[PDB]
Amino acid sequence: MVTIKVFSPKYPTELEEFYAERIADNPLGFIQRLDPSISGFVQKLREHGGEFFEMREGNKLIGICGLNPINQTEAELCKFHINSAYQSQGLGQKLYESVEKYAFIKGYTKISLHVSKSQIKACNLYQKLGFVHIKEEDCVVTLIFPTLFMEKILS
Ligand SMILES: [K+]
Ligand SMILES: [K+]
């Protein structure tokens, strides 16, 4: 039974551990800009009016997804991460579709996101989910993070 809900920890550090496992899952050897802890992020997101979701297989946390309000009608998808062993079942898509229905019910008509240009598999999923390419920027930080900005209108 795959279940999607608002994230609720089984134990206080469950999210930290899940997130560290996702960051550790880097087989192509991409450079990583590490991120408060994810639990702090979630707390702040909820205080700002956002929401943070789990997907579980039985009791096992297998995915997460955040929604962060930009304004009255646009939300930003954030911290979207699936355990890569569940990528061929289309469970990333299942979690996103639940999150999207939630967004829609909440009065959002646009979801925006940004993603590293190196992350092919992620970009390909977002395309599959109906995100459209708006712009690329090499974000200077000197480290350059080539970044893809995408949106989806909801109906
Ligand atoms: K890289
Ligand atoms: K819903």
Numbering used by the authors: 0 to 34, 37 to 142, 148 to 161
Copy out sentences from the published article reporting this entry, exactly as the authors wrote them.
HP0935 is a small (161 amino acids long) single GNAT domain-containing protein belonging to type IV protein acetyltransferases. A biochemical study showed that HP0935, the only known protein acetyltransferase in H. pylori, can acetylate free lysine amino acid and lysine residues in proteins. The crystal structure of HP0935 revealed a conserved GNAT fold, characteristic of the GNAT superfamily. The structure of HP0935 is composed of seven β-strands and four α-helices arranged in a topology—β1· α1· α2· β2· β3· β4· α3· β5· α4· β6· β7.
The apo- and ACO-bound HP0935 crystallized in distinct space groups, C2 and P61, respectively. A key observation was the partial disorder in the α1-α2 and complete disorder in the β6-β7 loop region in the apo-HP0935 structure, as evident from missing electron density. In apo-HP0935, the α1-α2 loop adopts an extended, distal conformation, positioned away from the ACO-binding cleft. A conserved water molecule, hydrogen-bonded to L78, H115, and E77, was observed.
